[PDB]
């Protein structure tokens, strides 16, 4: 009774259709819930390998505050839409794609060039709108592999890369009981991905990262 700690096993995984997970763990020793939740949240938020959009350039524009006829949105708006875009890329660190098209209607993520190894996880996603007969949209996008969040000021138009796949991660700790056990904490990880990787593989990846960070100790 010097190292015997109550090893918990999840009591439930309330998983929603695509990317919302509510994982429940219990029982955890007094206070361990907060430390585990904090560590998992920090790992999933700050340091997580991934690939996202780095920069974008437009043939017919050279300034952030400008517009193109036939696009009822603005180039800032298409930048914002590209921010939420999700993509999976092989070990290749970087790749450049384009939205070269000339048509009428929404520009969906399915329309982007397939470009072999890269994979679009939300083809139905809409990037922008086109309506005019001759209005053609053509741009170059660069996607690069990173392990965090890089705002614009930290650095052709720039795109802040949300490399990490977790969109919203929140955790809670509620009292849990085991017979006469005084007060054992029960952890609830409510977490959300972008769809590239399912919630559970993301949690497992974060746990493995932290374990390898701890392997150097024992």
């Amino acid at each position: 009774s010097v190292t015997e700690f109550l090893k918990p096993r999840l009591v439930d995984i309330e998983q929603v259709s695509s990317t919302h997970a509510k994982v429940t763990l219990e029982p955890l020793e007094r206070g361990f819930g907060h430390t585990l939740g904090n560590a998992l949240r920090r790992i999933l938020l700050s340091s997580m390998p991934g690939c996202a959009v780095t920069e974008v350039e437009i043939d017919g524009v050279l300034h952030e505050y400008s517009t193109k006829e036939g696009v009822q949105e603005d180039i800032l708006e298409i930048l914002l839409n590209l921010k939420g875009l999700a993509v999976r890329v092989q070990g290749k660190d970087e790749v450049i794609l384009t939205l070269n098209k000339s048509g009428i209607g929404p520009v969906t993520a399915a329309d982007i060039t397939h470009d072999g190894d890269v994979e679009i996880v939300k083809p139905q996603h809409v990037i922008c709108h086109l309506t005019d007969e001759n209005a053609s949209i053509s741009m170059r996008i660069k996607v690069q592999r990173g392990r965090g969040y890089v705002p614009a000021s930290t650095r052709r138009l720039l795109v802040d890369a949300c490399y990490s796949p977790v969109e919203r991660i929140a955790y809670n700790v509620e009292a849990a009981r085991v017979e006469q056990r005084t007060d054992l904490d029960k952890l609830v990880i409510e977490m959300e991905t972008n769809g590239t990787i399912d919630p559970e593989e993301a949690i497992r990846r974060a746990a493995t990262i932290l374990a390898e960070q701890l392997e150097a100790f024992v």
């Binding site: 949240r41 938020l45 700050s46 800032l76 930048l79 914002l80 839409n81 921010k83 939420g84 969040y149 705002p151 614009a152 802040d160 949300c162 977790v166 969109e167 919203r168 991660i169 929140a170 959300e192």
Partner: peptide, 18 residues
């Protein structure tokens, strides 16, 4: 002075301290 795609990444930005 930036642009956020939704509340989720607003929470992500605040809690991360950035």
């Amino acid at each position: 002075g930036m642009v956020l795609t939704g509340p989720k990444e607003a929470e992500r930005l605040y809690r991360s301290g950035l």
